[PDB]
Amino acid sequence: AVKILEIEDLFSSLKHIQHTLVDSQSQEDISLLLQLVQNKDFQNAFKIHNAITVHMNKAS
Amino acid sequence: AVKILEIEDLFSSLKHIQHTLVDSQSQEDISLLLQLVQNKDFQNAFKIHNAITVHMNKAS
Amino acid sequence: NPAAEKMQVLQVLDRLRGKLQEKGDTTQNEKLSAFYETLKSPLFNQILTLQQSIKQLKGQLS
Amino acid sequence: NPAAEKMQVLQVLDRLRGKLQEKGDTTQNEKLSAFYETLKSPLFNQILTLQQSIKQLKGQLS
Where residue B11 falls (left for φ over 0; alpha for ψ -120 to 50; beta otherwise) is: alpha
Integer CA distances (angstroms), B15 to A2, A53, C14, D31, in order: 36, 28, 48, 12
Among residues A41, D6, D9, D29, the alpha carbon closest in space to that of B50 is found at A41
- Angle among Cα C44, C45, C51 to the nearest 5 degrees reads 95
Contact B37, D36 (CB under 8 A): no
Provide the shortest C-alpha distance from residue D60 to chain B (in Å): 16
CA distance C11 to D1: 41
DSSP for C2-19? Answer: THHHHHHHHHHHHHHHHH
A contact set with B (CB within 8 A) = 40-41, 44-45, 47-48, 51-52, 55
* Annotated domain spans of chain B: 1-60
Phi and psi angles of residue C2, each rounded to the nearest 5 degrees, phi first: -70, -40
What HEC string does chain B produce?
CCCCCCHHHHHHHHHHHHHHCCCCHHHHHHHHHHHHHHCHHHHHHHHHHHHHHHHHHHCC
Residues 6+ apart with CB under 8 A from A43: A7, A37
* Cβ–Cβ below 8 Å for B32 and D12: yes
CA distance A52 to A48: 6
Contact C51, A43 (CB under 8 A): no
CA distance A18 to A11: 11
Q: Which CATH superfamily is domain B1-60 in?
A: L27 domain (1.10.287.650)
Nearest CB partner across the interface for D54, out of C43, C50, C53: C43
- CATH top class, domain D1-62: mainly alpha
CA distance C53 to C15: 29
CA distance A8 to A19: 17
* Set of chain B residues whose Cβ sits within 8 Å of the Cβ of A44: 44, 47-48, 51-52
Query: Can you say how many angstroms the Cα of residue A24 is from the centroid of all Cα atoms in its chain?
Result: 20
Residues 6+ apart with CB under 8 A from D55: A52, B41
* Set of chain A residues whose Cβ sits within 8 Å of the Cβ of D62: 60
Helix pair angle (D29-40, D42-60), 10° resolution = 80
Provide the shortest C-alpha distance from residue A60 to chain C (in Å): 19
Contact D25, B20 (CB under 8 A): yes
Chains within contact range of chain A (3+ C-beta pairs < 8 Å): B, C, D
Contact B44, C46 (CB under 8 A): no
* Set of chain B residues whose Cβ sits within 8 Å of the Cβ of A52: 40-41, 44
Contact C48, D62 (CB under 8 A): no
* Set of chain A residues whose Cβ sits within 8 Å of the Cβ of C44: 45-46, 49
* Cβ–Cβ below 8 Å for C48 and A9: no
* Annotated domain spans of chain C: 1-62
Torsion of the alpha carbons at A14, A10, A2 and A58, rounded to the nearest 10 = 170
Torsion of the alpha carbons at D36, D38, D42 and D45, rounded to the nearest 10 = -80
Integer CA distances (angstroms), A26 to A9, B29, C43, in order: 19, 54, 29
Provide the shortest C-alpha distance from residue B32 to chain D (in Å): 7
* Cβ–Cβ below 8 Å for D38 and B14: no
* Set of chain A residues whose Cβ sits within 8 Å of the Cβ of D58: 52, 55-56, 59
Contact C35, D46 (CB under 8 A): no
Minimum Cα–Cα distance from D41: chain B residue: B1
Q: What is the largest CA-CA distance in chain C?
A: 50
Sign of CA dihedral A41, A56, C45, A38: positive
